[PDB]
Each structure stands twice: as C-alpha cells, then as structure tokens.
Design a protein around this ligand. Structure first.
Ligand code: SRM
Ligand code: SF4
Ligand SMILES: [Cl-]
Ligand SMILES: [Cl-]
Ligand SMILES: [K+]
Length: 538
C-alpha cells in the first residue's frame, strides 16, 4: 500500500465533512447526493421546517427535493416507503442498549395511532423501535415530541453509525460480565452529538454497526458488528478487546476479526472515534457493495488499518489485545423469556414474546401500563424482537401472570416462537421479494402443531438478500425469493439456510436448499427439525 493511499479523502468545511475535490472521481450516486447537499442540514439548520411544507407531488418534481425525502431524510431517521406505502415514512430511533421508558412508549403509540391503518410499530434486529405511517408535514412536530420525551432519531439510516447494541440483561443479570448501558449510552451520545447531530461521523462511506458485550451468552452478536467491544482484563485493568469489520450483505458475509487492540474502559469513545475517522477518511466510495469497513481492512491489511486507528488515538497509543477476554467459552445461551430473578434481591424481570416484533398503538399502551404497574416504567427491547420488563417486585409476579395481555405477549410461548425473527418484508419494504412477518408466523404455527421439541431452534426470515433478519445466524434461515410451482406459475419462496451458530462458538450458515415454494416449507421444516434437532412428531 502506497503512502498516497493514506491521504484523508474528506475535509471539514463549515461544520460538515465533505469529500475533497480531488477524491470525487468514480463515486457512487449516494456520494453525489451527499455532495449536492449536506443531509445533516435538514436537522442542524432546520431545513426540515421548509421542506415539510412542500406538497409531496411537488417535491417529486425536482431531483434536489426528491433526494431530500428519499435519501437525506434517513440522516433524521426517516425512510420514505416510496414503492409500498407512498407518501408515508418509517421512522427509526437511536435506542442504545434497547432501553425505553413507558412515557416514551406512550408517545410513540400516540404518533402511530394518528395514522390508523397506515400506522404500527416494530422492534428491530438491533433492539430498536421503528414507527410507521408518518406524513412529511407532521415531521417537525414529531421531532419536537421525540426530543421532549428524551428520544432521538438521528443518524439511524444510510451512511451512519447504527443503533449501539448491548446486553438486554445489563444491570439485572446475576451472571453479567459488565453493565453495557453506560458504554452504549456514551456511544450514542458521541454518535449523535448529544442529540444535536455529529457531522464528524455522519459522512461515512457506508453504514456501520457497533455493539458492546456484557454477557457470556453474547446476546450482542459481536461476530457480526463493524466494531465489537469484548470485555477483557489486561495487565490488571478492566477494558475491551476490539473486533472489527463484521458485516452482512447480498454479496458477502464476514465475521468480525481481531484488531489486535485492547483499550481501557474509559477509552471506549476515543477508539470508536479513531476507527470511524479512519473509515471516513480512507474508505472506498465506489461500488456500494464494496464500501463496508471490512473492504478497507482487506485493502490495507488488518495491521495497516490498525496503524490508521493508532495515529488517531489520543497520544497515539493503542495497546495490543489481551491474550484472553472475560467471556467464558463454557456457556449455554440462556432463555430470557419468562420470569427470572435479578441480582437485586426481591426483584425479577420478565421476558415477553412479541410475535414477529409487530405491535399496534393499543399494544404499546398496554405494555407501557404493565411496565408502570409492575416494573419501574422501563421496557427493554431485544434483537430477537421481544421485550423484557425489568425491576418487578417478585411478590407481584403471580398477579402479572394473570394479566390478559400476556395471552398475546406471552412469557412462555411455544419454543419455536421464542426463537423466531423476521424482517419487515414487503408489507412496507420496497426491496422485499416476499411477505415475511405474517407468513413466518403462519408457517411456524403449522410446524409447531406437527412436532414437539426441546432444543431452542432459532428460525430467521428475511425478505431479500440484504439479510436484515440475519439468516446466516439462524439454525434454519429463510431468504425470500420468487420461484415456481409444479405448473410453472410464479410463487413466493425461500432459499433455506442451515449451519448458523451464535455465542462464542459462532458460525455463519449457508444456503442448504434453493427456491422452495413457501407453500411447501412446512413439510421440509418439520422433517429438518425431526432429523437434525431432535423434534418428535405429535
Ligand atoms: C428494520 C430492520 C429489520 C427488522 O425487521 O428488524 C431493517 C430494515 C431495513 N434495512 Fe436493514 N434492517 C435492520 C437491520 C439490518 C441488519 C442486522 C444487524 O444490524 O445486525 C443487517 C445485516 C447486518 C449488516 O448490516 O452488516 C441489515 C442489512 C441491510 C442492508 C445491506 C447492507 C450492505 O452492506 O449491503 C441494507 C441495504 C443498504 O444499506 O444498502 C438494509 C436496508 C434496510 C432498509 C432501511 C431498506 C429500506 O429503506 O427500505 C429496511 C427498512 C424496511 C422497513 O421499512 O422497516 N439493511 N439491516 C433492522 C433495523 C435495525 C435498526 O434498528 O437499526
Ligand atoms: S432483508 Fe430486505 S426485505 Fe427485509 S427489511 Fe431488509 S431490505 Fe427489506
Ligand atoms: Cl438506509
Ligand atoms: Cl421504496
Ligand atoms: K419476537
């Protein structure tokens, strides 16, 4: 690698970071959008106020404003559903560590309630909230309302740092390694500039996923993040070994690799900044399929990349990884659904199954009511698109288990439901090849009617090769496709994946059988469960 390759390609100009004039050749169309107008101005210079007044049909008549609503608004967490729900916007938060309050939950419910059949909400595979039905004229008021309740939607889509994932049992599990909330909170504060916007990290070549590990279970999936903090003691000090570059895409899925770096606990933000600056400064900005950070690591070599991180650290110091970390390899991933004692004597948490992560406004209000009546007004989201209500006096559990809503959002659903994960799919997502959420529920129900089992088999349904529902981590994964029935008619199908493992002994699954019509999946899955996962026909 020539020295010229290491010249920073972006520069700070008037508070924002822009591609240098000599580094604009051959860039992709998204990079052109960012150059044409700085997306962060919609928030930081209140550009959204005037944009929101322009009728959408007029917005669509000029490239600048059409790019504003289709692309730039993702920097404000707003995602135009152009193809499948025209004129409506999905809105995605920052929610470090998946932690929400009842007041926040009620606020989100009140927003989606306004939109009737166009509204609903979803828990995401980054333990985050998305709401649906938003119309552009309402955006300024919603942004204000989010801030009022202590929420932000900043920098949650496009070429930004995505939701910081942590341990859903942080602070409450007797077996936790380290409470991840302070660290994920710090990361989110850094990323969003304390909810004002941080232009220093908003012009990346591509999305970038961070997590902080605090569980032996590795609930945080560090193997598939761009930056994962692995808790580790080094020379008598608490800190983190760093894994880098994990990612999924249509073209390539790769597990994170060691940076060969350890930082003290207090250097979590400094090293996040250094890595992001290196990625921002040096990353490829051509073909969008080759812009994730792992491609930069492959180009420079991990040592070459490490040197770039090191030079951007305070006092330019970056220690080598500790030989061992604190995560115990002898571990069995624990079920968090149901009632579990907390480390605080006399208190329990309850994990509740949210079928395919989908809720309506009335459901959100009911969950918020439960968190207030039984817990401390806190609701935690999980990456399996479920919830935990922590801090429940154990004496209240008997009454809680009798609550009617727990028949729908159950502490003990059938085992296949416990592990079921499904992306948005074509109900709302324009890239989706198939419907996912309703279909996955129907198929899983039919499968479980036919077989019993004791192994916690994890089934993931994703609607296109973007693999937002992470089919490569699943025991059985389903990737949407179009295929053919016996008469040659077009039908929805799935490519079936096997071999995904999570926890310390992680492994990426691969396609097992292509092009299975969705209507033929039940017998295939029933047999896979009996033959490979110890299931017993009923
Ligand atoms: C909601 C969510 C799936 C879910 O049902 O839970 C989701 C939904 C979408 N993803 Fe994703 N992704 C979601 C997690 C992921 C993950 C999983 C993860 O982070 O562990 C991945 C794979 C891991 C990764 O990125 O390394 C993922 C890989 C992508 C990709 C492919 C990335 C790539 O490098 O090629 C795209 C397309 C893109 O960015 O170019 C994408 C694009 C999208 C968009 C924004 C496309 C769009 O504008 O329509 C989807 C919005 C649909 C909608 O209306 O909900 N989504 N997406 C997840 C939101 C997470 C969050 O709260 O921030
Ligand atoms: S995997 Fe595809 S269909 Fe599913 S939410 Fe992501 S982009 Fe949409
Ligand atoms: Cl996006
Ligand atoms: Cl679309
Ligand atoms: K779920």
């Amino acid at each position: 690698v020539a020295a010229e390759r290491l010249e920073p390609r972006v520069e700070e100009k008037d508070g924002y970071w822009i591609l240098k004039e000599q580094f604009r050749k051959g860039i992709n169309p998204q990079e052109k959008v960012k150059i044409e107008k700085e997306p962060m101005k919609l928030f930081m210079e209140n550009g959204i106020e005037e944009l929101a007044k322009i009728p959408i049909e007029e917005i669509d008549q000029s490239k600048l404003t059409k790019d504003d609503i289709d692309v730039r608004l993702k920097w404000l967490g707003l995602f135009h559903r152009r193809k499948n729900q025209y004129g409506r916007f999905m809105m995605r938060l920052k929610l470090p560590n998946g932690v929400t309050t009842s007041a926040q939950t009620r606020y989100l419910a009140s927003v989606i309630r306004k939109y009737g059949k166009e509204g609903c909400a979803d828990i995401t595979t980054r333990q985050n909230w998305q709401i649906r039905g938003v119309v552009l004229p309402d955006v300024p008021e919603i942004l204000k309302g989010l801030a009022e309740v202590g929420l932000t939607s900043l920098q949650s889509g496009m070429d930004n740092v995505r939701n910081p994932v942590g341990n859903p049992l942080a602070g409450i599990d007797p077996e936790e390694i380290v409470d991840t909330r302070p660290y994920t909170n710090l990361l989110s504060q850094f990323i969003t500039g304390n909810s004002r916007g941080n232009p220093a990290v908003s012009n990346l070549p591509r999305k970038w996923n961070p997590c902080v590990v605090g569980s032996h279970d590795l609930y945080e999936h560090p193997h598939i993040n761009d930056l994962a903090y692995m808790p580790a003691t080094k020379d008598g000090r608490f800190g983190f070994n760093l894994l880098v570059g994990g990612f999924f895409s249509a073209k390539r899925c790769d597990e994170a690799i060691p940076l060969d770096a350890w930082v003290p606990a207090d250097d979590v933000v400094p090293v996040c900044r250094a890595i992001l600056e290196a990625f921002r400064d040096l990353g490829f900005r051509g073909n969008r399929q080759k812009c994730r950070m792992m491609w930069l690591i492959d180009e420079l070599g991990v040592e070459g990349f490490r040197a770039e991180v090191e030079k951007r650290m305070p006092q330019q110091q970056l220690e080598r990884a500790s030989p061992e970390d604190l995560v115990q390899k002898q571990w069995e991933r624990r079920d968090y659904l149901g009632v579990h004692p907390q480390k605080q004597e006399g208190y329990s948490f309850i994990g509740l199954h949210i079928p395919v992560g989908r809720v309506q406004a009335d459901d959100m209000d009911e969950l918020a009511r439960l968190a207030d009546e039984y817990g401390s007004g806190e609701i935690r989201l999980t990456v399996e698109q479920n919830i935990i209500i922590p801090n429940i006096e154990t004496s209240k559990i008997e009454a809680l288990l009798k609550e009617p809503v727990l028949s729908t959002f159950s502490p003990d659903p059938p085992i296949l439901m416990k592990g079921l994960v499904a992306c948005t799919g074509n109900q709302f997502c324009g890239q989706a090849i198939i419907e996912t959420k309703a279909r996955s529920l129907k198929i899983t129900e039919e499968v479980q009617r036919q077989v019993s089992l004791t192994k916690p088999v994890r089934m993931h349904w994703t609607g296109c090769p973007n693999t937002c529902a992470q089919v490569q981590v699943a025991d059985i994964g389903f990737m949407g496709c179009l295929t053919r029935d016996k008469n040659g008619k077009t039908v929805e199908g799935a490519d079936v994946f096997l071999g995904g493992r999570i926890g310390s002994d992680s492994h990426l699954g691969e396609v097992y059988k292509k092009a299975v019509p969705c209507d033929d999946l039940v017998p295939l899955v029933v047999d896979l469960l009996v033959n490979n996962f110890g299931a017993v026909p009923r």
